[PDB]
Amino acid sequence: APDIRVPVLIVGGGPAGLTAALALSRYGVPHLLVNRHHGTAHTPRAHLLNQRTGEIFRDLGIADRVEAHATPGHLMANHVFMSTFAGPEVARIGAYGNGPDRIGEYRAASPSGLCNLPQHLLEPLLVEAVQEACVGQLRFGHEFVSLEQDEHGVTSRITDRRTGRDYTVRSDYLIGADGARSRVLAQLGIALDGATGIARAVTTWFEADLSRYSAHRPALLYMGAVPGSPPADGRVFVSLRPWTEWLHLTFPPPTADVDVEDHEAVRAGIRESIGDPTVDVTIKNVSAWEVNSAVAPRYASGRVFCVGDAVHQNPPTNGLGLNSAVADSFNLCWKLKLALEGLAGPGLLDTYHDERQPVGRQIVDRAFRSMVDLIGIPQALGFTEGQSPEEQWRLLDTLHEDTEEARQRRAALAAATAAIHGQANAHGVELGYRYRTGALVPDGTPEPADERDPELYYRATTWPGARLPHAWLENGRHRCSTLDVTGRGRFTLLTGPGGEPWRDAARDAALDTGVEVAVLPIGAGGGPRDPYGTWAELREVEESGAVLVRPDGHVAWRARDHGHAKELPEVMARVLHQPDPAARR
Amino acid sequence: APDIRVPVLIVGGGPAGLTAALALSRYGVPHLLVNRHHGTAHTPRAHLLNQRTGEIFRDLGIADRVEAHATPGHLMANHVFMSTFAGPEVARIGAYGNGPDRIGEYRAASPSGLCNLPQHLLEPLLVEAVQEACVGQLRFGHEFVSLEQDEHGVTSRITDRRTGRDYTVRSDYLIGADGARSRVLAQLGIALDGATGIARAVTTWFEADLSRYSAHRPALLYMGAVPGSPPADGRVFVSLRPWTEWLHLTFPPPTADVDVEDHEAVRAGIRESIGDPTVDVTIKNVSAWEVNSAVAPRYASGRVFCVGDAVHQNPPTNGLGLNSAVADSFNLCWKLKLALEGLAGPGLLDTYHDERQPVGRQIVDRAFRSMVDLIGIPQALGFTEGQSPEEQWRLLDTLHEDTEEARQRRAALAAATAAIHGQANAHGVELGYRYRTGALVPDGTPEPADERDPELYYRATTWPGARLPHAWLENGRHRCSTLDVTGRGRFTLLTGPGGEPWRDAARDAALDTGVEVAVLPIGAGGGPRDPYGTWAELREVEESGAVLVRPDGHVAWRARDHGHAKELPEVMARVLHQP
Amino acid sequence: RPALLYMGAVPGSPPADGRVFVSLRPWTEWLHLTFPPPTADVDVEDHEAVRAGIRESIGDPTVDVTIKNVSAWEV
Ligand SMILES: Cc1cc2nc3c(=O)[nH]c(=O)nc-3n(C[C@H](O)[C@H](O)[C@H](O)COP(=O)(O)OP(=O)(O)OC[C@H]3O[C@@H](n4cnc5c(N)ncnc54)[C@H](O)[C@@H]3O)c2cc1C
Ligand SMILES: Cc1cc2nc3c(=O)[nH]c(=O)nc-3n(C[C@H](O)[C@H](O)[C@H](O)COP(=O)(O)OP(=O)(O)OC[C@H]3O[C@@H](n4cnc5c(N)ncnc54)[C@H](O)[C@@H]3O)c2cc1C
């Protein structure tokens, strides 16, 4: 006899969990979320919000609230390598699409920019949105202990940490959003692939007016090396509030004792990284963080689905962790809604693993290689163990000399610096991932490809599994994206001139499946216009064709022309995995 | 074969029709709206937004946009009777719940205030919200010509006025939102009851800095009488942007040359009303419009439903027309949504007329009686036709003498002033209307009644048919009304401690009817809190009981205790009029 | 749809009767350029004719138009 019955139990109220609660809130699905801690994040942790996250927050209706508090992209314009903050600079690249060679592609790719908003500010914004909708319930100070699942539901044991009293929750489904060392994932018998404690990071949150060393070269990341240090002893400054509020990251050797409470010693390390004793440093927090590089081989078992840091862990390079957490929960929730309605079978819920687990592998691999690229810069300079400050100042000074030695060091520094685009301008990784199996019906066309590095370069496509291309439309006098007039908990069929047969096809699809397909003509039927012609360029179907958009803004299917309209009802049945045991496997 | 097939055609793009397109947008219902004019309203027209409209705009997600542009309630604090604007004042009452004797009741009654936002500003906000949703389609410059309907739908003939191209729309339902002289209502064979041209009103929109004559007595309405005029020649000043943007209203006798383009003449008239020839007056527009008071005996026929000015017309007094237009469309759209999904029949759509026609009768009668009350002030002062300026100045001055004559006029003024509460503080009209037949199950309790004038005084109740009472809840640390956590396209069952049996009952109701009833415990089960205990006081059920709230914020049913749980499935089948 | 140049054509005009709006102070101060035919009598003092033409170019008579200057220029 269970204490609570609810359609969905969310375990964990970090970004992944709160994203799932907000999505289910927007879709009208009652849920309970339990979070072990009494409050939201009390330190910055992850901060970089990429364009995909920006699009998901527009769909969930919180983008304006996030933007009001976040650092804007133009104050993240560079990625800097330096000696001390007050000393000579080593190298610099354009970051986050601000450089003239990337800014066009970044603007064409999304209605959203990149911005910077740390977790102690983001999480309260998600909490407020969830409380305002009043569809599900948040319980902070409540700890998940264990689960059993069966054919029909999931029975979970929960502890109220204040009262010490246990209770049980019976749910149709459970979301594991409980972060690294997930108890939910463990209870499923799923063990991550990869290494644990591959490094420690010591992250210090502090206040210091460093505007004299930063404002002329605005950046999110200033990566420093104090002359007389081995190459591994890099000092990473992260701008949180230009140019007064900061993180400082060090990577202590495996055999160093870190006293997180020793503010005195941490303050002296930061003053050494700055190299200007007149800058007053106030410590706000110091945290030691075990860095892993690991990914779950399976994301789900039965009626339990794990998201975010429960199924992927990586170094902070690329800032992919937070963005991938948001996109995991946004992939899953519209699928749980249709299953709970009886409009989709367990076959649709299986596509969560099929679509998201390969992205988990991709981001863990990319973040690892970007962490290893960092040491290339001080190596190119000729920095090693056992060098005096004076020897390293001389290597920096002799860098610009008219010798064979200096020419080769300048070449090695340019090559080491070029590789940092893999973390500063990784547009293909951020926006260009495509689901190749899952809640989609291939059209028989080959995947578009070119000679450009697919990690660095995004290429807009309606190929099924791809995120729908962004184009500026106009609805009367209202400027709106292709991504703004799709999603929001429904399927949308984008059509054009000569697309009338799509209306009866969509009508038949909804009758056969009980799922509505909204028909939206662009540049026809009095619908939104394509003022620049950009949508006609990107849609890759003819005027009479169609692009079928899922509730998460990925393309489920496309059709060159209205010759394919009669396929739509069967396409929708296959996307929804509607349990037809005669249906064709 | 029709040109266009669409669930709902809305005819008319004023407040009523734009509200319907916004509600249908929020509910995900594809629709088409045609409006004969190429633009939204080009002059202020209706401006007073009452608390109930504020609540509906909170439901439809646009109340913050409206509030950013509107005059706030505290700047509409008085209703003023005066001579000239620059001359001596005659009388004053508190307005719109600003007086100390009404402010408490107005604050407890709603999460929303009253505000002032003219139609030329409000209509673009609704259009923008509809275009942003991109669920339905707006076509301005398109004119409805005629319809025919059958068992299965409605076929309308439309003309594109710029091209003269004609086309046909086949819709399941049609909303007539086409305003006064509704072409849609006519084609239904339904004629209004009440008179036409009961008067002519001349409305001048102008700019003048009158802060010196208004700031010390903030009002929406300054009602003046230039000494040497008959009582019927009242000048109504309406504040639009304190204190530089105004309307000036007059009621010329049904015989008089009204040149609307004669600006220099209107301008001279406004200057005389002000009584201070140094004030610069810039005319922005002059409009003549015929004041009616009629109400349709029937709001609907078959698959066609008429809202707002199509079905009720009244003088501007009480500003009920704009508010009632919004509440008509909000009553109707959630019922259409359940009808289109096959979860309700024509029986639910019949409740539109049953609920809203009686409110149309009430507002037309109240507004007429409020218009008639206005002449009572100048009459109390002893003003009549055929008096000189000096004669009327003398009567103003003598009003405060220690004579019997002056004692009597003083008493007659006070009584005529007290009647203006029926337009200035008519809280029971604005918020307290209750549906007694329609999409509701009466609980078998007698309707709460009391001694207070029910036009003036709102009495909060969960008696089925009433608007759900406002209480402040807190959901975690988020402050929210009972009205914020209900509505928004769904049925909600508010419960309390010992209400667990309502869980199984709502699930059974969903199985039998196909309509979800969201269960929301207050002060139990980790749900929203009632920090003051106000909700426990207003809910008029026990802790273990239930209040069933409709998508429009009205109560469909209540139950004293959890023993009534087993009744919820049949209650839901009767509210939805399932065969 | 922010622009320096908004080039209009009032339906029922010859192609050569283009109306060019030039944004000078977004969105309250403007130029309006026409190219009258070589026959036309241009009266740079008839503010009320010029005003009626701008209102026509705009297509919304609720927009108040205040003339600052009219000039004819030999291209
Ligand atoms: C100390 C620390 C510092 C970090 N700093 C950075 C950084 O600088 N840059 C960067 O890019 N990434 C960083 N990360 C990772 C980043 O914070 C995550 O990628 C991001 O929060 C997404 O995580 P999530 O919501 O999946 O999990 P989390 O943020 O870990 O949240 C999961 C939540 O579940 C709760 N929980 C755990 N067990 C239970 C249970 N049994 N019952 C109920 N609740 C439970 C936890 O209390 C926690 O609130 C850091 C991580 C940690 C742990
Ligand atoms: C000149 C004027 C001044 C007013 N001033 C005041 C005031 O000061 N105070 C006050 O309280 N009330 C006033 N009103 C009334 C007030 O505007 C209405 O109560 C309010 O507009 C709500 O109206 P609605 O949406 O029902 O209709 P409306 O605002 O009349 O809008 C209906 C729309 O339908 C369109 N239409 C008509 N026929 C067709 C067709 N065949 N096809 C397509 N579309 C069609 C019209 O173009 C119009 O835009 C005024 C009305 C008028 C006409």
Ligand SMILES: [Cl-]
């Ligand atoms: Cl804690």
Ligand SMILES: [Cl-]
């Ligand atoms: Cl938003």
Ligand SMILES: [Cl-]
């Ligand atoms: Cl709002």
